[PDB]
Amino acid sequence: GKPLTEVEQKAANGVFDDANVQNRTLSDWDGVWQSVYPLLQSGKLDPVFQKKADADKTKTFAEIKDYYHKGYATDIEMIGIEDGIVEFHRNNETTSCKYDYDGYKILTYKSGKKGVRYLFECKDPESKAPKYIQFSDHIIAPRKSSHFHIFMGNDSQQSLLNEMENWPTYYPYQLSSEEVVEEMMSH
């Protein structure tokens, strides 16, 4: 964690120019990562949603939680990334691929906020890993990720760009559940 520059902080809140977006390498996401979904399911994220619903007079607790329930849903409990390989862990079963970088795509949301998807492709015919994956983590140039959202599929990169409601979400495996909540409480 270098401190964020001025550009980097605005970019994290979805305000950036296209010309400042730069390519990134898979190693920005090296590490071992826990899905946050079990934390939602156990009620451990509720203080996140309590705070959010309190601050937002247009949304109820149930509106906030449901939106994140839909967003975080996945049975990939863990992801490991190392030496250009991403490993996916579902109930006792592991798949992995040496992913190739395919560039990024800039998306503009209805709010007018912006974000960048970083696209990779698995070209390994033996692999059972998703053929396409996209990383989104409020960062628009090389920098070690502190948490990320990942889109996974076997159909097309465009199909994943169209996705807006499910975005399995990963924080460092080493963080306690309390620390995830505190991170969520802020950023």
Binding region for Zn(2+): 138, 147, 149, 183, 187
Contact 165, 71 (CB under 8 A): yes
Contact 72, 169 (CB under 8 A): yes
Query: Look-up: residue for tokens 């120019």?
Result: 17
Residue positions in the annotated binding site? 138, 147, 149, 183, 187
95 phi, psi to nearest 5 deg: -120, 160
Helix (H, G, I), strand (E, B) or coil at 130: coil
Q: How far is CA 33 from the centre of its chain?
A: 11
**DSSP structure class, residue 142:** S
151 phi, psi to nearest 5 deg: -110, 130
Question: For residue 35, which of 82, 87, 1, 72 has the smallest C-alpha distance?
Answer: 72
